Structure 1
Amino acid sequence: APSRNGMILKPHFHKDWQRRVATWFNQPARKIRRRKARQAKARRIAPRPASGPLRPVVRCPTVRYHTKVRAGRGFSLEELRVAGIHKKVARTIGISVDPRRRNKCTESLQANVQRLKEYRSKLILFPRKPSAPKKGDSSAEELKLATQLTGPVMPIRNVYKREKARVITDEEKNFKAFASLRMARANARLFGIRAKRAKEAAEQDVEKKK
């Protein structure tokens, strides 16, 4: 029974919230259950980036979100034959392989290749055995470190480049940026209809001829 100005309210408690309520007095003991994993996993895999394997730079999808960047799932395949890394080797070398990405542009390809090129260079391949041959990095580059990378390997920060102030040529200063949007949005509006008339008018030039 409402009385004099409120909202309507469709609170959804007609069902049976009561039985299926989860309270959260786990929350802090869970925090700790978790702690001990983060903790244990690291001490188990001693020299290995604690965070996890290396994971690619990647762009967020839908239109609003565009300008952001992420750790993606894993680096593409096309990406690797280019960096010269075999896909099944990568998986052993702490390089994250999604094999399910349609690579569309050279911009985000080489951007993401440089991460592998970077990785190779600052990676100490700890050799199969102690008395081991090629590709494993030398006993100097080996003593120096026992270093787990705390935090995400080569963390991906959204970084922009400053544009210095300009002069504004009398040409940037003529472009009516509103008008040209309305143009755009009407040519894209009617591109299709306009094409039907060229198709009819091209029909009349043949139909007038016969």
Structure 2
Amino acid sequence: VAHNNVLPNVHLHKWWQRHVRVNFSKNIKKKKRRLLREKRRKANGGTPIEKLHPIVHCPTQRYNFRTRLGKGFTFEELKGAGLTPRAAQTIGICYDKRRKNRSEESLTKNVERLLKYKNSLVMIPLKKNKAKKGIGGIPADADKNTIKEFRNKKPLLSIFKKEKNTKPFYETIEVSKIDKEFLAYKTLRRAKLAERRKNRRQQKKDIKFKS
């Protein structure tokens, strides 16, 4: 090395020409999967190819405020919507047995979403114009004239898409309604100082509760 330069650390000391790859076929495969999903959606028969997903908070403390699509609703969410999972997988509803609803807000943010999805169901007959009431909480089925008049409108995909969340960053309050005496920094320091003994207290509380 020489002159004033950053000391090299280039991890290139093995046979790397074998590992080098270049993505010449990026837009080509983007097109191929575009036509793949278009063919799937055209062939399935008008049913949307997307599946409904829960709107759920992101983990950790970095992404506490953000929310995103999750892997399937919970059993209690489906029960509150009135659907057994084992029959709700049929209507494009994702379900997982691993998530647990840890808050009433999480429960109630997915229940009405499931109800909104259920409000748009249009069942189809199976036995050559022999429409039936349905099973397992799936909504009712429609007849010849009904299917002939609904099968040709604009499909709704916004509900399938991630729920846009509008949070009012710009908001304000009355000047006289402020708690002028609060000490946020002192509160933070006191909480950090007192963290150990509260853990002690919770430990002893639960030891008592074990009895």
CA distances 1:32-65 after superposition (whole Å, capped 9, x unpaired): 2212211111111121113x11111111001010
* Equivalent residues in 2 for 1:49-64, closer than 5 Å: 49-50=48-49, 52-64=50-62
User: Which residues of 2 match residues 53-202 of structure 1 at below 5 A?
Assistant: 53-129=51-127, 130-134=129-133, 135-137=140-142, 139-140=145-146, 143-146=149-152, 147-149=154-156, 153-161=160-168, 164-169=171-176, 172-191=179-198
* Pair 1:5–1:92, CA change in 2 (3 A): same
d(CA) in 1 for partners of 2:111 and 2:170? Answer: 26
Write the letter of the residue equivalent to 2:57.
Answer: R
- When structure 1 is superposed on structure 2, of 96-105 and 143-152 the one drifting more is 143-152
Does the 8 Å CA contact 1:68/1:158 hold for their aligned counterparts?
Answer: no
Query: Does the Cα contact within 8 Å between 1:124 and 1:142 map onto a contact in 2?
Result: no
Q: How many residues align?
A: 193
Q: Counterpart of 2:42? A: 43
Which structure ranks higher in relative contact order (CA pairs < 8 Å, sequence separation ≥ 6)?
1
Q: 1:193 to 1:112 in 2, by over 3 A?
A: closer
Question: Secondary structure at 1:116's aligned position in 2?
Answer: helix
- The CA distance in 1 between the partners of 2:5 and 2:180, in whole Å, is 52
Pairwise CA RMSD: 2.5
SS at match of 1:143: helix
Call closer, same or farther: CA 1:162–1:124 in 2, change over 3 Å.
farther
Listed one character per residue, the Cα deviations across residues 80-100 of structure 1 (whole Å, up to 9, x for unaligned) are 111110111100011111121
TM-score normalised to structure 1 length: 0.81
Runs of 5+ unmatched residues, structure 1: 196-210
Distance 2:181 2:166 in 1: 31
| SS of aligned partner of 1:166 | strand
Structure 2 CA distance for aligned equivalents of residues 104 and 141 of structure 1: 41
2:206 maps to what in 1? none
Aligned to 2:205: none
1:134-165 Cα distance to aligned partner (Å, 9 max, x none): 21145436513434445671531122246752
Maintained 8 Å contact 2:117/2:159: no
SS class of match (1:78): helix
In the alignment, is the contact (CA less than 8 A) between 1:49 and 1:153 conserved in 2? no
Aligned-partner residue type, residue 23 of structure 1: V
1:88, 1:41 → 2: CA distance? 24
Report deviation, 1:194. Answer: 9.1
| Runs of at least 5 residues in structure 2 that lack an aligned partner in the other structure | 134-139, 203-211
**Amino acid corresponding to residue 65 of structure 1 in structure 2:** Y
Bigger shift: 172-181 or 183-192?
183-192
Give SS of 1:165's match. Answer: strand
* Structure 2 residue matching 1:58: 3-state secondary structure: strand
Question: Percent sequence identity over matched residues?
Answer: 33
Residues 59 and 66 of structure 1 are in contact (CA less than 8 Å); yes or no, is this contact kept in structure 2?
yes
1:141/1:159 CA distance change after superposition, 3 Å: farther
CA distance in 2, matches of 1:193, 1:71: 38
Q: Structure 1 170/100 Cα, relative in aligned 2: closer, same or farther at 3 Å?
A: closer
